[PDB]
Design a protein around this ligand. Sequence first.
Ligand SMILES: [Ca+2]
Length: 224
Amino acid sequence: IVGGYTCEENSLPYQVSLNSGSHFCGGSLISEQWVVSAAHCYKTRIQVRLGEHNIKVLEGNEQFINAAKIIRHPKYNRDTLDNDIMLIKLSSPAVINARVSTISLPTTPPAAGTECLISGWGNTLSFGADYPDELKCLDAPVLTQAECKASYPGKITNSMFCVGFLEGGKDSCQRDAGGPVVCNGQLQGVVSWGHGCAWKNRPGVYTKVYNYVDWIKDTIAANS
Ligand SMILES: [Ca+2]
């Protein structure tokens, strides 16, 4: 996250870190046993780290749980990032407390102009790189679809929306992928195209979670 702020510790209790040795992607806890992330974050083995603030320091509220099932959307396209969404089933249920809690699925798509919260441990610089120890946050509005399409002509599919500032300065960046975009208490997005890194006319592109609610439900049911 570029141009954001350090979140209050454990104030985003749905935010998880995906780990394969080290942190490499974000995700969101949507039920005691399931996490939503980006399909491009797939690895054949993933440890989900919940309750984190500083990912380098065991602070005492963490839960480390291995992924038991890692399911990409079946229409995921690695090249275009169409349908860039994935579900992780945890090996044991998360323990719900002040520091580990779920985020509601959305009941409607988000309107342009809605204020959202994007978070993660990705690069915090537009020039060079700094990967933070503590979770970063960014408040940003949903952009109109025309602004999104004009930023990336021919590349914005029906599964995508943009959040940010066409002027640059505040955005997601490398290793925020997979993480949450939360608007009015609901998970509306998954960080998908997180290479814009706050450059002008290159806002972040996010997967429209609302378009996948039925797939999410069906997948949970099929693997429960
Ligand atoms: Ca920690």
